[PDB]
Amino acid sequence: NPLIIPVVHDLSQPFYHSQAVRVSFSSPLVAISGVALRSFDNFDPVTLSS
Amino acid sequence: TADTPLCLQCKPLKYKVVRDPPLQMDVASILHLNRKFVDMDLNLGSVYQYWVITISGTEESEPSPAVTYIHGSGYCGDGIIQKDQGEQCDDMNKINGDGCSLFCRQEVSFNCIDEPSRCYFHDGDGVCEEFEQKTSIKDCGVYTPQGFLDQWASNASVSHQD
């Protein structure tokens, strides 16, 4: 039920700061209770790679 | 051929050169069939602006853009590079086929390294330069991006060593 989507990303491409999540569906019976976003509590790779 | 019998009846158009200090009446009244102009009455310090109109018959066309010439200073054919006037190179060629054009600008993928502006082609050359790193990847090696760093192999082993 808490479906997890692994973000696919190449390290050769520079990182990006995610801001919003759009979920699209065409069937009317899909009901969403809540979306989330998993990040690193250790390091942030955007503030250093300016 | 060099002398066709059909273009003999066409009268060529003429050019008249006007200077910002006015010349004498014996110089400004003549018309030049060719595009070559020489004058003798000059001063060592005063500047001169030249512009040439192109007449066909009695009608006079619009003037050319003026060129500022100093009898003491240089120009784009003197052989001395003057970077205060925007000259990247200065030779005596007056030919666009060379690495340095007649408008005192070097061509694409060329570099001139001397006072009379002899220029060489650097893309196929085997010597890396300061500016050649980010443009020519085929001479200075692989371009390391500003956010990353490349590290090459050390103590590498192969399979079919011979």
In this complex, is the C-beta atom of A27 within 8 Å of any C-beta atom belonging to chain B? no
Considering only CB atoms, which chain A residues are within 8 Å of B148?
12
Beta bridge pairs of residue B115: none
**In angstroms, rounded to a whole number, what is the distance separating the alpha carbons of residues A47 and B146?**
15
Of B132, B110, B129, the closest CA to residue B120 belongs to B110
Cβ partners under 8 Å of residue B77, min gap 6 = B90, B91, B92, B94, B102
**Own/partner pairs for B139-147, CB < 8 Å, 24+ apart?**
B147/A14, B147/A49
Per the rule left: phi > 0, alpha: psi between -120 and 50, beta: everything else, B125 is: beta
| Alpha helix (H) residue ranges in chain A | none
In the block, tokens 């006072």 appear at B115
| Alpha helix (H) residue ranges in B1-140 | 25-28
* Shortest distance, CA A49 to any CA of chain B (angstroms): 7
Nearest 5°: CA angle at A32, between A27 and A33?
160
In this complex, is the C-beta atom of B150 within 8 Å of any C-beta atom belonging to chain A? no
Q: How many CB pairs under 8 A join A and B?
A: 3
Of A24, A22, A21, A25, the closest CA to residue A39 belongs to A21
